[PDB]
From Swiss-Prot, chain A:
Ranges where the record places region RNase H homology domain: 7-237
Annotated localization: Nucleus
Additional information: Present with 468 molecules/cell in log phase SD medium.
Quaternary structure and interacting proteins, as annotated: Component of the U4/U6-U5 tri-snRNP complex composed of the U4, U6 and U5 snRNAs and at least PRP3, PRP4, PRP6, PRP8, PRP18, PRP31, PRP38, SNU13, SNU23, SNU66, SNU114, SPP381, SMB1, SMD1, SMD2, SMD3, SMX2, SMX3, LSM2, LSM3, LSM4, LSM5, LSM6, LSM7, LSM8, BRR2 and DIB1.
Signal peptide: none
Outcome after substituting residue 21 to N: Reduced growth at 30 degrees Celsius. Strongly reduced growth at 16 degrees Celsius
Name by which UniProt lists this protein: Pre-mRNA-splicing factor 8
Domain notes: The MPN (JAB/Mov34) domain has structural similarity with deubiquitinating enzymes, but lacks the residues that would bind the catalytic metal ion.
Organism domain of life: Eukaryota
Designated gene of the protein: PRP8
Functional note: Functions as a scaffold that mediates the ordered assembly of spliceosomal proteins and snRNAs. Required for association of BRR2 with the spliceosomal U5 snRNP, and the subsequent assembly of the U4/U6-U5 tri-snRNP complex. Functions as a scaffold that positions spliceosomal U2, U5 and U6 snRNAs at splice sites on pre-mRNA substrates, so that splicing can occur. Interacts with both the 5' and the 3' splice site, as well as the branch region. Has a role in branch site-3' splice site selection. Associates with the branch site-3' splice 3'-exon region. Also has a role in cell cycle.
Residues of the full protein shown: 1836 to 2069 of 2413
Curated annotation (Swiss-Prot), chain B:
Phosphoserine modification, residue list: 236
Function: Component of the U5 snRNP complex that is required for spliceosome assembly and for pre-mRNA splicing. Involved in splicing pre-mRNA of the A1 cistron and other genes that are important for cell growth.
Protein encoded by which gene: AAR2
Recorded superkingdom: Eukaryota
Stretch list, region Leucine-zipper: 244-265
Protein's UniProt name: A1 cistron-splicing factor AAR2
Stored Gene3D superfamilies: 2.60.34.20, Aar2, C-terminal domain-like (1.25.40.550)
Length: 237, 300
């Protein structure tokens, strides 16, 4: 059934699972036409598919050409996502295929269920968590590869960098979700917090700065402050 | 006109013949039902006074033999049976008519209700859904489950309706996932109509049989089947025109006949709102939509 706060530790057991988020697949800018009407211009997207135990981010870039001449693009987008997840599973050796795929929006269940009829033993599940994966386009390197793509293209990163060498999946997922939630709530302040100190660098294959343990604690504390504050500024408290 | 005599009425029972019904008191002198119109299927059903649980009855066609009802005190139900001795049967029926111990099938001459609710229902097809080939009549009751319900437990006593499942490999062509799921014309026209049912009369015949079993016996799985077969049509962008015009009539009469107080359990809010207001065929069921909105505007 649905994934919620009560069965949260299942994410970190040894059953392979993926999270799939489709928020950023179909993206537009809205602008005025010469005649004073409004039109959209699509920009590149991505499917955010993530193994929460290993940190593997299978990032599938969606190039604007995929929409050309199509109607009902918000609905097509959900199916286009399901088609790509399905192709990804089929590309993986059997022992690497997920036993469960958890979709972050309920509108994805039927498109993915239908694309995965070939895989009756893969459970397709929703969640009651309000996960901040839509903020993934606030991660500079992810946004850069998405925006520069001139064709469809799959890119790979470990969203946990090398963290698992020192911390558990559980803690690594909790850090990731705190960083994303902060980037979603106040992007500028979140980024200032991460990059203020020029001496902490981001390695070439990594997405986040190379913080020591003590520095991650400071950072984590500063993101929690941010999220509590903006929640006052937003609700005046 | 034909006759279904009864040996006796040993227990108090509400007897139904098609859309009509009447109360028989324990050991009342009742010897059966006369003037049954030839040329249609019929259903004679029972609800005991002591146990409103278990409605049951018998689908039959008087052209396929001489049938009678006889209470069985071991199994405790009114059983349909066939008499093969045609002379014995006529003699018995004549005796009972002379003494006037039979109720008359009470058809009004303006009334085509039963015809319109059974137009495509044929005994030979009923017998394939209700597997019991040693009898020319078919027993149904409230508790019998469907072949798809047993997939989701006794196979001999099930209803073998045609399995319809919108999220199945049969319904969905590789490479047309979104196309085939949002627009079920492939599945209706090629898989089901050309492939399984062969024509729209047989399709409509299962649909009508499913509806009647739902109404008369409160059979939950028949109710599911009836809604399924409606939804498949309504969710197909491409449907022969004659089938839509007939579907509208079919449903019109089913809605007209449904007991007003049973609407809450026999009608699925989601299916009907989808069919009447969101589906490809939302503008195609003028008679059905008009009676639905005037009789059950609550459901919508
Ligand atoms: O391919 C990489 N890691 C192998 C495991 C993965 C599978 C799927 C995604 S990662 C990789 C690439 C770039 C940065 N760190 C690691």
């Amino acid at each position: 059934g649905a994934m919620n706060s009560s069965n949260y530790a299942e994410l970190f057991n040894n059953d392979i699972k993926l999270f799939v988020d489709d928020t950023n697949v179909y993206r537009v800018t809205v602008h005025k036409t010469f005649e004073g009407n409004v039109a959209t211009k699509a920009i590149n997207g991505c499917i955010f598919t993530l193994n929460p135990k290993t940190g593997h981010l299978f990032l599938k870039i969606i190039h604007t050409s995929v929409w050309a001449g199509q109607k009902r693009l918000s609905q097509l987008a959900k199916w286009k996502t399901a088609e790509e997840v399905s192709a990804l599973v089929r590309s993986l050796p059997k022992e690497e295929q997920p036993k469960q795929i958890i979709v972050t929006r309920k509108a994805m269940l039927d498109p993915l269920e239908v694309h995965m009829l070939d895989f009756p033993n893969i459970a397709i599940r929703p969640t009651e968590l309000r996960l901040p994966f839509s903020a993934a386009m606030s991660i500079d390197k992810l946004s850069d590869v998405v925006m520069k793509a001139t064709e469809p293209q799959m890119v790979l990163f470990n969203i946990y960098d090398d963290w698992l060498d020192r911390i558990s999946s559980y803690t690594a997922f909790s850090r990731l979700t705190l960083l994303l939630r902060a980037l979603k709530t106040n992007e500028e302040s979140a980024k200032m917090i991460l990059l203020s100190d020029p001496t902490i660098t981001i390695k070439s294959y990594h997405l986040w700065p190379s913080f020591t343990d003590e520095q991650w604690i400071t950072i984590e504390s500063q993101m929690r402050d941010l999220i509590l504050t903006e929640y006052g500024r937003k609700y005046n408290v | 006109m034909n006759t279904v005599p009864f040996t006796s009425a040993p227990i108090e029972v509400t007897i139904g013949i098609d859309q009509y019904s009447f109360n028989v008191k324990e050991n009342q002198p009742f010897h059966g039902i006369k003037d049954i119109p030839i040329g249609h299927v019929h259903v004679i059903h029972f609800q005991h006074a002591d146990n409103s649980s278990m409605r049951y009855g018998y689908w039959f066609d008087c052209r396929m033999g001489n049938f009678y009802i006889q209470y069985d005190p071991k199994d405790g139900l009114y059983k349909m049976m066939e008499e093969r001795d045609g002379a014995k049967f006529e003699n018995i029926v004549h005796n009972f008519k002379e003494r006037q111990m039979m109720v008359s099938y009470p058809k009004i001459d303006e009334d085509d209700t039963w015809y319109n609710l059974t137009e495509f229902v044929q005994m030979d097809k009923i017998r394939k859904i209700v597997r019991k080939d040693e009898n020319q009549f078919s027993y149904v009751d409230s508790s019998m489950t469907t072949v798809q319900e047993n997939e989701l437990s006794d196979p001999a006593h099930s209803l073998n309706y045609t399995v319809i499942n919108f999220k199945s490999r049969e319904a969905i062509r590789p490479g047309h996932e979104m196309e085939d799921f949002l627009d079920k014309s492939y599945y209706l026209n090629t898989v089901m109509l050309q492939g399984i049912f062969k024509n729209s009369s047989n399709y409509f015949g299962e649909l009508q049989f499913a509806f009647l079993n739902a109404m008369f016996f409160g059979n939950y799985g028949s109710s599911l089947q009836w809604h399924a077969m409606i939804e498949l049509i309504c969710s197909s962008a491409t449907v022969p025109k004659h089938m839509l015009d007939k579907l509208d009539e079919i449903l019109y009469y089913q809605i007209k006949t449904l007991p007003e107080q049973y609407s809450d359990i026999l009608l699925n809010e989601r299916v009907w709102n989808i069919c009447l207001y969101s589906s490809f065929q939302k503008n195609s069921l003028h008679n059905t939509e008009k009676i639905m909105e005037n009789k059950y505007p609550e459901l919508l």
